[PDB]
Amino acid sequence: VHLTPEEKSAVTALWGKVNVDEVGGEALGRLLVVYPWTQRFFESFGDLSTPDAVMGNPKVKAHGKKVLGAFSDGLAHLDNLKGTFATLSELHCDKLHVDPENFRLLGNVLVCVLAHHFGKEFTPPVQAAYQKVVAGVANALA
Amino acid sequence: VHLTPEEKSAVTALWGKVNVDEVGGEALGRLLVVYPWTQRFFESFGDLSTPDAVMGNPKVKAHGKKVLGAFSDGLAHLDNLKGTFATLSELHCDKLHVDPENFRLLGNVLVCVLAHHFGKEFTPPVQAAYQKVVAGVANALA
Amino acid sequence: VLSPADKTNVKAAWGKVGAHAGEYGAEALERMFLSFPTTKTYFPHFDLSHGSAQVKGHGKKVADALTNAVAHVDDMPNALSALSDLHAHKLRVDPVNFKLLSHCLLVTLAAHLPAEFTPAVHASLDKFLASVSTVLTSKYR
Amino acid sequence: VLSPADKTNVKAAWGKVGAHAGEYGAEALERMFLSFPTTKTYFPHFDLSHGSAQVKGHGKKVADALTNAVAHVDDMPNALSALSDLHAHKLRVDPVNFKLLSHCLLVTLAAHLPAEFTPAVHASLDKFLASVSTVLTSKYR
Numbered sequence A, B: 001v002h003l004t005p006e007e008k009s010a011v012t013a014l015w016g017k018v019n020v021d022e023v024g025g026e027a028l029g030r031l032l033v034v035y036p037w038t039q040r041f042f043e044s045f046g047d048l049s050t051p052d053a054v055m056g057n058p059k060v061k062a063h064g065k066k067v068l069g070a071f072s073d074g075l076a077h078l079d080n081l082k083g084t085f086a087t088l089s090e091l092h093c094d095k096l097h098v099d100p101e102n103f104r105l106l107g108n109v110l111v112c113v114l115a116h117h118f119g120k121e122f123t124p125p126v127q128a129a130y131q132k133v134v135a136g137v138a139n140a141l142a
Numbered sequence C, D: 001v002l003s004p005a006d007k008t009n010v011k012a013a014w015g016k017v018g019a020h021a022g023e024y025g026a027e028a029l030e031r032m033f034l035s036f037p038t039t040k041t042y043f044p045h046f047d048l049s050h051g052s053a054q055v056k057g058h059g060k061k062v063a064d065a066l067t068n069a070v071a072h073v074d075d076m077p078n079a080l081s082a083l084s085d086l087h088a089h090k091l092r093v094d095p096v097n098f099k100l101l102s103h104c105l106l107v108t109l110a111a112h113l114p115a116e117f118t119p120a121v122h123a124s125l126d127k128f129l130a131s132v133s134t135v136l137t138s139k140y141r
C-alpha cells in the first residue's frame, strides 16, 4: 500500500471536507441495507428492519463514526497498516471474523457514499486512490 | 501464517508422499478445465480445447511442477511468506497480475486433487491445515 | 446453463455416492467447520465435534436438499424456493459461505470417488453446486 | 429475484440518466480501468486514456446493453443471450470483473444523481447489476 504523492493528495484533499459526523453512518447503514446478511453481524444494534429503520438507528450512526476513524487511522499509517489495525481487531475478540469480503464491501459502500456526497469532485483518479486505500485496510483486518 | 505443530505434521507428512512430477500438472489442468476463463493467462501454452487436451498439454504439466515448487517453498517459509513469493511475482513482470481470487481457486483445485489422490488419508483436519497454507500463499502472491 | 452432459455427470457421481449421502454431507460440514471456522457462527446451538449426531443429522438434511435439486435440476428455483427463503431471509447467510461448503462438498466427493472425479465430472459438479448456491442466494438479488 | 419495486427503482434511475447514458458508461469504464488496472488486459487494442473515442463508443455499447436488460428485465437471459456468449466463451472474462464494473457503475450513478441514489435505490441497482452479471457469466455454470 504505497500511495504516490498524487494518490496521497487526492485522498487527503477530499477527506478534510468529509462531514465526519454522518458519512460513517451513511456508509454503514447502506451496507446493512444493500447487503442484508451483514445485519447478522449487528441486529444486537437496535431495529434493522427497513432502509429508514437502518439509516436512523442510533448505534449504526455511532459505529459509523468509529469506522470513519478507523479509516483515517489507516490514512495516517499506510506503510504499516497491519500494525495499526492490530489492537483494533484484537480489542474486538471475535466480532470481526465475518470474512474479508465484507470488509471489501464496506469499503466499496463508503466509496459509493463519498461519490454521492462529492459528485463531480469524486473523479475517477480520486476514486482509484481510495480504492487502493480501502483495499489495503480491508486486507489489514486479517 | 502460524501453522501449529500438528497442522505442520499434517501438511508435511502428506506432502512427502506426493508425486511431484504431475500432481502439479493435474491441478493446473483441472483449473483451466473447471474455471475456463483462466486459460486466457495461458493458451500460449498450446491447445486448451477439451478436458482430455488440457490434461495432456505438456506446458500445463511443466508449469504444474513449478507451481508445486512454489508450494514447497512457501511451506519452508511460512512466517515471511511475502519474503518468499517476492522473487516469484517479480520475475513474472505482469504474469501474476490477475485477481487474487484465481490464486485461491488454484489452491482449492489443488486441495481437490490432493483429496483425490489420498482419499481417506485427506481427513478434514488434514484439509484444514492445507487451507491455511493455500490462503497465506494466495495472499502473498497478490 | 447445466448442459445435458453436466446433468449426466452429476446424476452419475451422485448415484455412486449412493446411501453414503448423509455421511458425505456430514463430512462436508465437518470439513467446512474446521477449514473455515467463521462458518461455525451459524451453528452455535450445535455440537460440532467429530461424530456429532447433529452434524450427521443436518448433513443428511443437506444431502437430501441436494438430491432434490439433482432430481429437479431443470426447476431448481421452485424446488429450492423454501430453502432460498430460509437461508437468505431467515438465516441471513453470507453468500461467500456457499462457495466454501460447495468446495468442501467437492473435496469430500474427490476423497470418496477417485474413479468418478475426473476433470469433466469435477467441472460439472462445480457448475451444479454453483447453480444451487445461486438459487439459495437469489433472495438477495 | 427482482421485486416490482426494484424494477420501479431501476427504471426510475435509468430515467434520470437520460441521454447521459453512453457518457456514464464511458466514465464507469474509466473508473474501472483506473481503479482496477488488471481489467485493462481485456482492451489492448484500446487507447484507454481520458477522452478516448474508443472508451466512449464502448461506454455507449455497455450503456445500451444495460438499458436493454432494463427494457427486458423479466427475460434477461434471452436478451443478454448473445452477450453471455461473447463474454464467457469468446472473451473468457473472469467473473470477478463483473463485480468491479458493477461497482464503478454504481459509483458513476451516485456521482451523477445525488437525489436518486437513496439507500433503497442503491440496493435495487445493486441487485439489477448482480442479475445482469449473473447472466453475463452463466455460460460458466
Ligand code: HEM
Pocket: A041, A042, A044, A063, A066, A067, A069, A070, A092, A095, A096
Ligand atoms: C466492521 C468495522 C468495525 C470497526 C471499524 C469498528 C471500530 C471500533 C473502534 C474504533 C472502537 C474503539 C473506540 C471506542 O471504543 O469508543 C470499537 C469498539 C467497539 N466495537 Fe467496533 N467496529 C467494527 C465492527 C464492530 C462490530 C461488528 C461489533 C459488534 C457486533 C462492534 C462492537 C464494538 C463494541 C461493543 C465496542 C466497545 C464498546 C462500544 O463502544 O460499544 N464493532 N470499534
Ligand code: HEM
Pocket: B041, B042, B044, B063, B066, B067, B069, B070, B092, B095, B096
Ligand atoms: C500462477 C502461478 C504461477 C507460478 C507458481 C509460476 C511459477 C514459475 C517459476 C517458479 C518460474 C521459475 C522457474 C524456476 O526457476 O524453477 C517461472 C517462470 C516462468 N513463468 Fe510461471 N508461474 C505462474 C504463472 C505463470 C503464468 C500465468 C505465465 C504466463 C505465460 C507464466 C509463464 C512463465 C514463463 C514463460 C517462465 C519462464 C520459462 C519457464 O521456465 O517456463 N507463469 N514460473
Ligand code: HEM
Pocket: C039, C042, C043, C058, C061, C062, C063, C065, C066, C083, C086, C087, C091, C093, C097, C098, C101, C102, C132, C133, C136
Ligand atoms: C449446498 C448448500 C446448502 C444446502 C443444500 C443447505 C441445506 C439446508 C437444509 C436442507 C436445511 C434445513 C435443515 C433442517 O430442516 O433441519 C438448512 C438449514 C440451515 N442451513 Fe443450510 N444449506 C446449504 C448451505 C448452507 C451454508 C453455507 C450455511 C452457513 C454457513 C447453512 C446454514 C444453515 C443453518 C444455520 C441452518 C439451520 C440450522 C438449524 O437450526 O438446524 N447452510 N440448510
Ligand code: HEM
Pocket: D039, D042, D043, D058, D061, D062, D063, D065, D066, D083, D086, D087, D091, D093, D097, D098, D101, D102, D132, D133, D136
Ligand atoms: C454490465 C456488464 C457488461 C456489459 C453490459 C457489457 C457489454 C458489452 C457489450 C454490449 C459489448 C459489445 C460491444 C461491441 O460489439 O462493440 C461488449 C464487449 C466486450 N466486453 Fe463487455 N460488458 C460487460 C462486462 C464486461 C467486463 C467486466 C469486461 C472485462 C473486464 C468486458 C469486456 C469486454 C470486451 C473486452 C469486449 C470486446 C472489446 C472489443 O474488442 O471491442 N465486459 N461488452
